[PDB]
């Protein structure tokens, strides 16, 4: 039994080809995993609180309070794009391919090992290690999804990239049900804001505990475990951003006079006056038909209220945004109209020699141009008396109730009849692959997280924990402290994923931006003499296309 | 599983025979391998520099600067002739055989073992060793060759000879791409030579990393691994040097008078004068047809500029030479017109008891006679006024620009229409077996290294590394220092190679030189009472043959 | 020995002295085996005499070159070691409104790196007495017959046994597609024109 090992170790990228533009991108990967024995034992419910910060006046949310159930188990999981792909391999996908389709996913675990630590006292101490055959490892994997769900990166504690370096899973946890309400506050607020907790509604409680649900293959080690392949169900994603904004929807007006000399300050003429132009329009009184005012088949994007926190069971939380900041060059900070900004560390950047610790941060803009730029928006009466007098219209400079930061733009919305937008572009390699789809019946039209969504059910996760041991002592069903033999165990892990894509084709006269090395990043790709690594972010949606 | 061992151990030479002169020489070998665990972990790029030596005036190249990528892995490899053959066996091949053909190659690895070191402190310390079953070994082998290529002996760090003594592979490494330029200098040079580094062209970068390419069978130990046999594609090599030089190409002139007495100072006569001779010639005015001046079907060898370093990305490097020094007895030093000179040590000579260390060096001449001897070459005008006056011709004693060491001979070349030469003779046992063939389309007509060349693709190598281990601590994708359990592992290795050869046959009246023992080397073959060994070099191309 | 700190002026060490190194070599006396001196499977490119006009029926004409200038950053002018330089006009550039006329010119370098850089080449005697004295070797600064522009490098050639190179890269869009092949029997191994 022990005298064999059944596994293989693969990180490869192989391009198999078919007829007529359909190309299977088949990527594999693997990692080495080390796993501490969980120090706790029983399932554990905890409520976290920090209030001096919500106590002091102001501080809308610098934090809230949550309650979770911490299992001893731990989660090895896929669903990053740094687990399988390489910024070397990533190139040939995004330059040649206009679309993706998802197919199939599978995992297996092979050649487990279990070790042991015996800590001497009178010795220095030195740590003895004797490989233990008869100890055991637990593997619990469900394809039913019944037990509750998370992906992981809302943080990116996910498996480390590169396949020479080990990586660790993370302890597994999920939200419980409480109630909280929090009243506003600011610097000038007097009295008390009345911040209170609020127990738990007993009507609704979920303790979900996998040992009450899903089987568990147990392993001493010669043995392997393999999950069969569970397919996906999805819709494709476009790799090609849409530049045309509400200006480019239509046929442009006809110039009646064409300019002359080469070199430019040279401006053509619309050739008619503003009064006599001919065309369709929507407006209160038109002797005016402009490049601006005119009927367009529909809008693009939506103006959304930004930084508005609606209250609920958890009270304060942020209301997300589905668009990019494209067209707005003057508002940055981090992600002004919203540009999801990843913060990770020590594991996929902030080059791998970093003394102490400190997070890593980059604002990821959109490469899609849909203008939501709030500045330069206002409203008129229906009379259209031009030039307009200050008393008959609005500006972003006008308060609400006598305030300043608010313009009017913080309270607005449209979205309704004519709007549309493009599915959120995938990001890399801190992003996410697939996402489970909501349980209710109205099925939001997208997610500001994942590119792809299983419309039926997504494949599950892989849970693992060391098997317990006792020496001699015990009490039955006791939350007192039972002694233990400190151990740990390593197991290799493999993964496979299947893609389908189509080659794009030129039909333009122009070349198109690609990713490539230069001297801007000269070496962001090549290791540092201590072994340094980064894998800087890279923006992929590179391909402009027609829209309407 | 552990209770078996599947391998066998072979060093043998068996001669299987066929009909009509075709004889298969089938040689096998094997070695014992010990392999330290690589102390580094991450892939590592390093640039080496030594400049005070290029700094000081003079010193054309006493060194340059290179940049490499050091993997943790290590390379066990064949492709020496001391790994399988014996100076006992080597005899019967070179005496009886006029040609070689290459056929097939294969390897396998069996009966691996893994050990462990636990270093005590309060103890002397003593090194404990406990055989670890569940630890692991990695084996990565590609028949695609995609991952970059080296053979190894540009140094001969290759596997040790003899099959009772262990041997170690070597850490594996390859060149990166930089730019360098270096200006000349000498003793009398004033000012500064302007020696500069020059960054890296970002346009072209290769990080090749096998874990991104080629699979890896993993092994705990009962298990074996075997690569199937990948054939060769080659052209034969002659074991028979060609003595005839441009004198022997033709039919010699006819003596009109034959000498008389026995014992010699006895010189025949060409019998005619120099004026009246009859024959073909190429020359400006012939009343003269000599043994020297006459039309020959073509030349032999080529006069090449020697010790001329052309500059490139690396700047200074030596321009090789494809011929031997045969015919030149007055120029030695080491390899004057070039006679590749091996320098090795401790592993295949410099008898195996040698205090401290010091390299070992022998100049390997050619046994082929093609004269390139530069002395005694000069040029005339087209008039041919004889005896010639010093002002109308040249000598090797005449400077260039007022120099001395240069004659004219350091700037010359011919090669062009009529030249030809014989493939470089194999050497032993420090030489090389096969060599991969260049990627570009013009395919140089030979190599001054290997006898044989795969015209399509050569078989790959065998890469191996210990599998890592952790006790308890870690950070994900961290270039900080993760602790480790110092281990090492040994595995037996076998090898097989297939040859095809033809027996030569006499047709002469004379015997022919062979290798054999004598008292010159009386014992260079027999061990020394401490266990000493040498395996002195041996020159094999022993057989003279006709040429034209 | 492997270097330590991150950030670089950090230089590894070959770790042995120059005398005790072990490996194959071709050279007159080696107690020295370098990164430079060592046996290589064959060369790359060829050093060719540049700007040398051989005479024939037409007398003067230029002797072409099959390599690129890659590795030589200090010699440009137009195509120093040769970098075929197209001159066209009015029809594929020199933007189509151009008063009067005037040609259009750009030096097309190679993107291939094969170094033919003539500077930094010289020769030694076979003795190898180092450091070498000015009287025993050559420099590009040394005349021929008392001249200056010539170094020695204008008269040299190699090409012979070990050389090789890559077929000329196509250029665009002023280049050429196909080319007819010569009538004689020896069929030059390529063309410095067509791919």
């Amino acid at each position, epitope marked *: 039994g022990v005298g064999i090992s059944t596994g293989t170790f693969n990180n490869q990228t192989e391009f198999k080809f078919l007829e007529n533009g359909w190309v299977y991108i088949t990527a594999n990967s693997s990692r080495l995993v080390h796993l501490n024995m969980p120090e706790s034992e029983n399932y554990r419910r905890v409520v976290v609180n920090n209030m001096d910060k919500t106590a002091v006046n102001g501080n809308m949310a610098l934090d809230d309070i949550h309650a979770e159930i911490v299992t001893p188990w731990s989660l090895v999981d896929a669903n990053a794009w740094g687990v399988w792909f390489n910024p070397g391999d990533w190139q040939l996908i995004v330059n040649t391919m206009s679309e993706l389709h998802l197919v199939s996913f599978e995992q297996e675990i092979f050649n487990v090992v279990l070790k042991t630590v015996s800590e001497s006292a009178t010795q220095p101490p030195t740590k003895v290690y004797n490989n233990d055959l008869t100890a055991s490892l637990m593997v619990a994997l469900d394809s039913n999804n019944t037990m509750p769900f998370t992906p992981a990166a809302m943080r990116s504690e996910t498996l480390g990239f590169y396949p020479w370096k080990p990586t660790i899973p993370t302890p597994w946890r999920y939200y419980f049900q409480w109630d909280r309400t929090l009243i506003p506050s600011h610097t000038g607020t007097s009295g008390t804001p009345t911040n209170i907790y609020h127990g738990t509604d007993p009507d609704d409680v979920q303790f979900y505990t996998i040992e009450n649900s899903v089987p568990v293959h147990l392993l001493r080690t010669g043995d392997e475990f393999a999950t069969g392949t569970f397919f996906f169900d999805c819709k494709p994603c476009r790799l090609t951003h849409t530049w045309q904004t509400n200006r480019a929807l239509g046929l442009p007006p006809f110039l009646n006079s064409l300019p002359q000399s080469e070199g430019d300050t040279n401006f053509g003429d619309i050739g008619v006056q503003q009064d006599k132009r001919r065309g369709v329009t929507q407006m209160g009184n038109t002797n005016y038909i402009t490049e601006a005012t005119i009927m367009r088949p529909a809008e693009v994007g939506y103006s959304a209220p930004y930084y508005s926190f609606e209250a609920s069971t958890q009270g304060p939380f942020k209301t997300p945004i589905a668009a990019g900041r494209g067209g707005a060059q003057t508002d940055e900070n981090q992600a002004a109209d919203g540009n999801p900004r990843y913060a990770f560390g020590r594991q996929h950047g902030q*080059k791998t020699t*970093t*003394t102490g610790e*400190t997070p890593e941060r980059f604002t990821y803009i959109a490469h899609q141009d849909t203008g939501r730029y709030p500045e330069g928006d206002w409203i008129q009466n229906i009379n259209f008396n031009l030039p307009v007098t200050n008393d008959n219209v609005l500006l972003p400079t006008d308060p609400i109730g006598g305030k300043t930061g608010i313009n009017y733009t913080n309270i607005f919305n449209t979205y309704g009849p004519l709007t549309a937008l493009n599915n959120v572009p995938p990001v890399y390699p801190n992003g996410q692959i697939w996402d489970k789809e909501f349980d209710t019946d109205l099925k939001p039209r997208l997610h500001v997280n994942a590119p792809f969504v299983c419309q039926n059910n997504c494949p599950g996760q892989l849970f693992v924990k060391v098997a317990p041991n006792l020496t001699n002592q015990y009490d039955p069903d006791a939350s007192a402290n039972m002694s233990r033999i400190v151990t740990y165990s390593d197991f290799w892990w493999k993964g496979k994923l299947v893609f389908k894509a189509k080659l794009r084709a030129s039909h333009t006269w122009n070349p198109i931006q690609q990713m490539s090395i*230069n*001297v*801007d*990043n*000269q*070496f*962001n*790709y*090549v*290791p*540092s*003499n201590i072994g*340094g*690594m*980064k894998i*800087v972010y890279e923006k992929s949606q590179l391909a402009p296309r027609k829209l309407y | 599983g552990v209770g078996i061992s599947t391998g066998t151990f072979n060093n043998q030479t068996e001669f299987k025979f066929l009909e009509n002169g075709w004889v298969y020489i089938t040689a096998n070998s094997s070695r014992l391998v010990h392999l330290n665990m690589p102390e580094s972990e991450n892939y590592r*790029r390093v640039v080496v*520099n030594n*400049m*005070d030596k290029t*700094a000081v005036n003079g010193n054309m190249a006493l060194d340059d600067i290179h940049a490499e990528i050091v993997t943790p892995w290590s390379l066990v490899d064949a492709n020496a002739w001391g790994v399988w053959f014996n100076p006992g066996d080597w005899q019967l091949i070179v005496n009886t055989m006029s040609e070689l053909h290459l056929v097939s190659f294969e390897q396998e690895i069996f009966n691996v073992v893994l050990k462990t070191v636990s270093e005590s402190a309060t103890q002397p310390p003593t090194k404990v060793y406990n055989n670890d079953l569940t630890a692991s070994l990695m084996v990565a082998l590609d028949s695609n060759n995609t991952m970059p290529f080296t053979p190894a002996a540009m140094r001969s760090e290759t596997l040790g000879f003899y099959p009772w003594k262990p041997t170690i592979p070597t850490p594996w490494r390859y060149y990166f791409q930089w730019d360098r330029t270096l200006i000349p200098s000498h003793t009398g040079t004033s000012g*500064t030579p*302007t*020696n*500069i*580094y*020059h*960054g*890296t062209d*970002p346009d072209d970068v290769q990080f090749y990393t096998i874990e991104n390419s080629v699979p890896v069978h993993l092994l705990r130990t009962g298990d074996e691994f075997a690569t199937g046999t990948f054939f060769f594609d080659c052209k034969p090599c002659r074991l028979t040097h060609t003595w005839q030089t441009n004198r022997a190409l033709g039919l010699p002139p006819f003596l009109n008078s034959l000498p008389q007495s026995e014992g010699d100072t006895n010189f025949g006569d060409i019998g005619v004068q120099q004026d009246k001779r009859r024959g073909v010639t190429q020359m400006g005015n012939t009343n003269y047809i000599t043994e020297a001046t006459i039309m020959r079907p073509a030349e032999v060898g080529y006069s090449a500029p020697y010790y001329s370093f052309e500059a490139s990305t690396q700047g200074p490097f030596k321009t090789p030479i494809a011929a031997g020094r045969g015919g030149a007895q007055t120029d030695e030093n080491q390899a004057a017109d070039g006679n590749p000179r091996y320098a090795f040590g401790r592993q295949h000579g410099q008898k195996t008891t040698t205090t401290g260390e010091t390299p070992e060096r022998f100049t390997y001449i050619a046994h082929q006679d093609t004269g390139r001897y530069p002395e005694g070459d000069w040029i005339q005008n087209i008039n041919f006024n004889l005896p010639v006056t010093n002002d109308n011709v040249l000598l090797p004693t005449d400077p260039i620009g007022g120099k001395t060491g240069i004659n004219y001979t350091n700037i010359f070349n011919t090669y062009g229409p009529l030249t030809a030469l014989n493939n470089v003779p194999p050497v032993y046992p420090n030489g090389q077996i096969w060599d991969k063939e260049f990627d570009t389309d013009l395919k140089p007509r030979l190599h001054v290294n290997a006898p044989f060349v795969c015209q399509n693709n050569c078989p790959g190598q065998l890469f191996v590394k210990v599998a890592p281990n952790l006790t308890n601590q870690y950070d994900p994708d961290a270039s900080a220092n993760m602790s480790r359990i110092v281990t090492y592992s040994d595995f037996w290795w076998k090898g097989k190679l297939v040859f095809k050869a033809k027996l030569r046959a006499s047709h002469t009246w004379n015997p022919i030189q062979q290798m054999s023992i004598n008292v010159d080397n009386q014992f260079n073959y027999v061990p020394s009472n401490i266990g000493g060994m040498k395996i002195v070099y041996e020159k094999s191309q022993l057989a003279p043959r006709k040429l034209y | 020995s492997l270097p330590q*700190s*991150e*950030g*670089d*002026t*950090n230089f590894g060490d070959i770790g042995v002295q120059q005398d005790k190194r072990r490996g194959v070599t071709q050279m007159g006396n080696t107690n020295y085996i370098t990164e430079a001196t060592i046996m290589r499977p064959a060369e790359v490119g060829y050093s060719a005499p540049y700007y040398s006009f051989e005479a024939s029926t037409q007398g003067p004409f230029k002797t072409p070159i099959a390599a690129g200038r890659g590795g030589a950053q200090t010699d440009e002018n137009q195509a120093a070691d040769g970098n075929p330089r197209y001159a066209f006009g009015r029809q594929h550039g020199q933007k189509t409104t151009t008063t009067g006329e005037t040609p259009e010119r750009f030096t097309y370098i190679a993107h291939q790196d094969t170094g033919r850089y003539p500077e930094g080449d010289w020769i030694q005697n076979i003795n190898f007495n180092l450091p070498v004295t000015n009287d025993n070797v050559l420099l590009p600064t040394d005349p021929i017959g008392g001249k200056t522009g010539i170094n020695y490098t204008n008269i040299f050639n190699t090409y012979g046994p070990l050389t090789a190179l890559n077929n000329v890269p196509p250029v665009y869009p002023n280049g050429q597609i196909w080319d007819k092949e010569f009538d004689t029997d020896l069929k030059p191994r390529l063309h410095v024109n067509a791919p």
Partner: antibody, heavy 115, light 106 residues
Framework: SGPGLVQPSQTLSLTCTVSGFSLSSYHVHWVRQPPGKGLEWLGVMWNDGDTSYNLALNSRLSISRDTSKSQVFFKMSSLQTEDTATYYC????????????????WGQGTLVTVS | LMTQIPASMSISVGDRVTMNCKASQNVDSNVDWYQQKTGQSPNLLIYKASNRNTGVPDRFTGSGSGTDFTFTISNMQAEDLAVYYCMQSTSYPLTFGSGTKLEIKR
């Protein structure tokens, strides 16, 4: 850089235009006190570099726009000042190794950055 | 490393002086000197000894090799004054010395 405390962001930029030889890569931001010090002389990023105290990292593209960054925060409680940033900018090192060495000229005198 | 002494020199215009330096690791001749030339400053004069150029020759002269260097001033005017610097160039890192302080005797 600053102003002023304890570790605010950015405000080091000069000089446009024609900032020097683009060799991959170059200096000089002047550097430093002037009585010191300092600053073991930038590389190019993945991995080429770098400076002598952590979180001193520098990055920029030598193509146009020719610019600089950050720089940087870093640890300013030592009240040190280099507020410009002007070029020529000799040989960096990394490239270098003449041996070394030498530094011709500079530009744009005193800019002082507060503690 | 490198230090710069003597100090407190008050001289008549045009007169000479000796300025010297001492260092540990053997520096070949990397030795350099920075001289205002007040404005735009420090505006190096002589490269590694000896190059009299920059900006025109024979204003000062350096010379010497190895662990020591001796800095020398031939032509002294009101176009040079106050205090100056020395460097060593070796490895990582660079290092500077500190100070001379020569002002015209008044």
């Amino acid at each position: 850089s600053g102003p002023g405390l304890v570790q605010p962001s950015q405000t080091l930029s000069l000089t446009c235009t024609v900032s020097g030889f683009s060799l991959s890569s170059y200096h000089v931001h002047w550097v430093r006190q002037p009585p010191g010090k300092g600053l073991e002389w930038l590389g190019v990023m993945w991995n080429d570099g770098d400076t002598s105290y952590n979180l001193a990292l520098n990055s920029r593209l030598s193509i146009s726009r020719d610019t600089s960054k950050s720089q940087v925060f870093f640890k300013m409680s030592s009240l040190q000042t280099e507020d410009t940033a002007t070029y020529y900018c000799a040989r960096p090192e990394l490239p270098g190794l003449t041996y070394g060495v030498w530094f011709p000229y500079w530009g744009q005198g005193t800019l002082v950055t507060v503690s | 490393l490198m230090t710069q002494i003597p100090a407190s020199m008050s001289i008549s215009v045009g007169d000479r002086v000796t300025m010297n330096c001492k260092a540990s690791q053997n520096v070949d001749s990397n030795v350099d000197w920075y001289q205002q030339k007040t404005g735009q400053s420090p505006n190096l004069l002589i490269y590694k000894a000896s190059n009299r150029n920059t900006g025109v020759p024979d204003r000062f002269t350096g010379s010497g090799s190895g662990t020591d260097f001796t800095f020398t001033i031939s032509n002294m005017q009101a176009e040079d004054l106050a205090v100056y610097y020395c460097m060593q160039s070796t490895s990582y890192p660079l290092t500077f010395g500190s100070g001379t302080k020569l002002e015209i005797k008044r």
